[PDB]
Amino acid sequence: SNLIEVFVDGQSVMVEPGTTVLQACEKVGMQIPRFCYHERLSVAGNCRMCLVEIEKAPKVVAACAMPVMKGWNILTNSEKTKKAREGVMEFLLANHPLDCPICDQGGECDLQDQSMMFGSDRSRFLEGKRAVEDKNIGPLVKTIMTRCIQCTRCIRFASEIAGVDDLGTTGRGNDMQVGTYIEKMFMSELSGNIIDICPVGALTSKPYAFTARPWETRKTESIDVMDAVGSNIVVSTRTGEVMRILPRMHEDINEEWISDKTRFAYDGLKRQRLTEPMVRNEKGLLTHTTWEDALSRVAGMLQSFQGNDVAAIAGGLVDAEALIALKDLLNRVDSDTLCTEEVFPTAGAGTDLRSNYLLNTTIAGVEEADVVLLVGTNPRFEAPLFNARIRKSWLHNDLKVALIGSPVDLTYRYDHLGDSPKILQDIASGSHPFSQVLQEAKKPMVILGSSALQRNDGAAILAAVSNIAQKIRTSSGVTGDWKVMNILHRIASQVAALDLGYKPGVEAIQKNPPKMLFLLGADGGCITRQDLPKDCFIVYQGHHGDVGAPIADVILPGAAYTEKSATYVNTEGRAQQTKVAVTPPGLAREDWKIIRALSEIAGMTLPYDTLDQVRNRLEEVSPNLVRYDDVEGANYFQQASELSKLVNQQLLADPLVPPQLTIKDFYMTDSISRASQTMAKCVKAVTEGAHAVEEPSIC
Amino acid sequence: DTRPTVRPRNDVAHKQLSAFGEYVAEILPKYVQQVQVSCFNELEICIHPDGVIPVLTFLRDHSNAQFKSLADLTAVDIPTRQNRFEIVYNLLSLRFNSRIRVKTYTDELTPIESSVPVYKAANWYEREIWDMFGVFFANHPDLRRILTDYGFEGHPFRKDFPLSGYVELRYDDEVKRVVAEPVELAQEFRKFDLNSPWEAFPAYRQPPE
Amino acid sequence: GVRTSPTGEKVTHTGQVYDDGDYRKVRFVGRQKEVNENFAIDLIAEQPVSQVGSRVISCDGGGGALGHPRVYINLDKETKTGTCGYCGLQFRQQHH
Amino acid sequence: STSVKPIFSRDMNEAKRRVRELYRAWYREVPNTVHLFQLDISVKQGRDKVREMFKKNAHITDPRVVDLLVIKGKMELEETIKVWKQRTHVMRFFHETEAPRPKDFLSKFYVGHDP
Amino acid sequence: TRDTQLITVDEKLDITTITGVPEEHIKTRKARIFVPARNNMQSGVNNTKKWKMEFDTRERWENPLMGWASTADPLSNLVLTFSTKEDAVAFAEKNGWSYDVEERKVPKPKSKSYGANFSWNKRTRVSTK
Amino acid sequence: PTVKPPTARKFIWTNHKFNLSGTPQQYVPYSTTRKKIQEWVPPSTPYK
Amino acid sequence: PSGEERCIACKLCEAVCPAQAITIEAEPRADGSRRTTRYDIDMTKCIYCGFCQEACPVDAIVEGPNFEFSTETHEELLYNKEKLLNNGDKWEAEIAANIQADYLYR
Amino acid sequence: KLGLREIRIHLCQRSPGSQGVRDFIEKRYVELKKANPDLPILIRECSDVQPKLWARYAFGQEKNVSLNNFSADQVTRALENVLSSKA
């Protein structure tokens, strides 16, 4: 149609107008050398390493920035092209420090690799070299800025992805220095990602400093559970230890970024771990025992008690395989009190319909939206990668964003409608000026955070926000399949638990207090020992000792997300499976195997012994939990609204205050993160500065 | 040929070997599938596995060939190919001071015809291929393991065989004999990922899929 | 320096020592735990800081080709001493 | 596509003939093997083991695979008959030192993480 | 054509019995067929051109003497390379391994304009070069 | 060495040692790294 | 000469070792230096090829002159960092002189 | 006891065979939920799945009914079979 024709070394490729020489060479399989160009950042054209000859043209052009013109023949392997690369590399390495042995970027450095492939084998630089001061920008990123090649990728990322304009260039010429000029910390929910984009060792990870080398690490592709975005990751393991977390590219979720918590919270998996089964002795203190004894004590009470006397609570980092396993075990004693720690309104159609509790528009849908209304949520901290997607559309598609909550810093300017929930009624009635915007918007998007649903008036907010979506969606302006209502979850286990049939919240456990309680990773303190029948036999299964373990009568160690192959469902509803990178530490075991073993001890043996058999059971309870990396559409939104209108509850006067308001609340939200010492240094930094957290950095 | 560090090129051999490849293809169309000559001047003939004896006999006995010596006979495992095993014959002609490589293919279950009738050197080479790769050579005088231990189960040189194997040996005083047990390593072999993410040789760039 | 644990075992320059209840200290019964007494962390600190008159100094570690790769150290911050990433030697800029 | 060069057998009926012939040779040879190698097992034990090996593969239905298994068996016969093997090789079929490994879920659960 | 005199075999290809692999390392092992992710620390894409096959990770433990990493998994460092997913699936099937296939994640084509950095009315205007 | 003597460093041994195998002074290998996974210490108080 | 270890934990010796005889773990020292916490050579895996002293960029690991270190047990030949440092302090005078003689050929 | 504890309906979004199940959800599901408030009726859509009706009775016993090529009325009767008759 509008495609033009260009030639790359004589081979024809049809490219859309506006395409660059670079992008054209990709379609024939050639990767132009690069140091400054990044496909997800703005073009800069400053490294000059992409220079490529166009036949019948006397000047080399920067492929990263020059659009192709019809008829151009691109000579990627010509002498002029090859000599341009050698010259540029020679300038890059002239003042570069001889630090490869002491530089953590060794073995995964683009300057090293591109020197070998596109550069000379020797130097003709007989002069002295430049040296630069080191700059402290926090406890997560180490700066050895003498290694900087002035590519300005960090400057562009902070401005164009993180929304923070704290990195820049000071001076000019050979003395031009990237930094903050002042002593400042580049603290953000996406700070760590400047480490990856920096092609050299100028920016490196402080926690990972000196621990390993790229070639000696085994790469395991798993998923992140610190949030509900389900960011795809790579777990680098050496000799049965976890060394670092790296992003794995998924276009429709995390692109190629991860949050700092995902990146730097892996070190809490090496502290405060549960390694051996524990039971209470006569004195009343937990003592180490064996799986045989501990499982026998637990099974005896399970046989004795029955019905509502048996209950369970699921935490934030629980896998679907264990959730269904526990459900079956408690069902076989005729107990349906399967509960979570995260509230979701049970009024109306509750969890009967998926659409009622999913981000139906998908993460990628935000790019196609025209208006976004955020209610009772700080997406910057509840879902760092989801906010980054909003800011992208804000920047490239000129999206309009409105918020009904406390005025927070989302890294992009937004229209603050107010904080009281009552504004949601006005937006429906039409009084509020923003009502016309949603009505004039072809593809509006309404997002309610699960944080706001934890309020005692949560069911009212959901129906009000649902009512808004119905009106504009029903009006012919909205398209055939655009889905306007969305719920943004902050917990990784919630969606799977809701899909599987768990009751959201611990309300049912306070209506009918249980005499036996299974705490399956529940460290949020929702239910304590002041809310249960005295003499409760509590069983805590998990990987960390935080809040649930010290109150339990039996402790059954379990694996973490790095140690098991488990299914997690994101806020979209997409199911993704982790993979084993290391194995469970001491006498710890896989979560679903502990329950399966317990069932056999108790006589209620479950019908699965392998992972592939418990995943078949997941299909029976919900076929979507085995379709990995596929988003399954949910419909029947009108049916859900009709049911919601019936009850009519009353909104409270309390303003919507998000649980997390500043960065300091971001870093510690779960057991793994609370154990981490790196997330403890981050918290100390954003509360006092680098006055004390600053550390020597010599190499 | 005045570049100190670059291997000199010999075009006279390239023209000579290329012509002889056309010579073989014209004479043996029934089996020859491909003929190629390399940059460093080596001729390779690629044949259907049913022409091993015809092609080898012609090369040995034809007066414009006389490849009387079988320097080597080996195999290569390429799992991605549906016929994973590539059988390679390297031959030497003393009369013409030349070498030729003959290639054919087979899979796990399909036999190849033994070349012992053509070269008596192939007896042990074919035994090694069977022992190491599991390829069966039909009508062999005595096909049996040659390099592996007695009773060894598996074909070590296949790309799917673990480097350290499945079993290990030790002496047990209870039974007063050497016994085999499953392999456990005090230090696991450390797999290093060395390949660079940046292409090195453009001329071999494979067409995009 | 070598400090001894309550059990009597010598601690290494990596901080390694077997705790009281570890069975692996039986390997030292009738034999010895070999520990180098020269702790490199203590010996480098003894070396005096070098006063130089430039914003940038080079270090090869001494011996030329028998040292370490040559690096250049910035001395423009007066709240710290420039340190070599290879040899650990410290340098300071002398007030002109 | 399905047309493939055979090894020896053209159909499973012709192949199963070679399996039975091979069992005959093995059954005759156990009595001599126990005597020659001076094993401490009974002839019945050895003939039971031969039956076990022949039973392991009792599911195959491909003529070519059965031919290879017969070929491999016959090779092991030449080794044992000609005393190329040794007492250690013959007794590796019986796995005497390997203590029994657990084969129930609970037993596997108590010991380790393996399936 | 081929005159060897051929036979028809309508069974599926299964070579498990003639590979010498212990039974435990066939039935209980799960293969992973994937295109390796690009290392996010480098921008090259030459290690994403071919399919791989790996196996499930199993226990590694510390040697009591020296603290090394000890394993009992023979297929720990086994990685196979394939040109296509179909080729890999065929190889796993004939060897009797259970497998999970994960589809290739290709970078999406994008719109890159150096002019947009200097827009007159848009938010793409950059504040620094 | 009586003519061209070795260079003097502080860290060099002053007293040479002959092979110490088979004696109480023999070298016994051990790991020089500290523990990797810390373990949760249960509370010292009796809950309830 | 200061007494500071030359090794910076670059792990080039570990990578080039044809026998996988070298095991290295590193962490930042209390003074921020890149130094090893583990440096183990299995001398029953070593082939005494000298690749690890060629690869070293700081002349830290060397194959010394001694050949009379036969042992009565296998365990005595699994060398750790302390053993290798004591050997350096034991043999430094000879090692340095030999390097002085051959470093111009290297 | 031995009564009903849960109902699960599985279907596809775009298949022809599941059209009947989609009709019940669009029209008669709302009526059903009001009639049986505290019972959990779970509708879970997923592409290319044979429609089915799962019922969980007390102590873990479960039954399944295939709804393939069922008209909406048949679906209503089948649900009435489950709700009326209990195991």
Ligand code: SF4
């Ligand atoms: S960034 Fe580090 S690894 Fe890369 S060339 Fe510079 S010193 Fe070497």
Ligand code: SF4
């Ligand atoms: S610090 Fe790294 S990313 Fe930033 S300009 Fe320098 S080389 Fe580029």
Ligand code: SF4
């Ligand atoms: S000399 Fe020994 S330790 Fe050094 S590289 Fe060679 S084999 Fe490895």
Ligand code: SF4
């Ligand atoms: S001994 Fe040398 S090569 Fe080996 S890690 Fe230390 S500095 Fe690097």
Ligand code: FES
């Ligand atoms: S990639 Fe084009 S100038 Fe840097």
Ligand SMILES: [K+]
């Ligand atoms: K970097």
Ligand SMILES: [Zn+2]
């Ligand atoms: Zn120095």
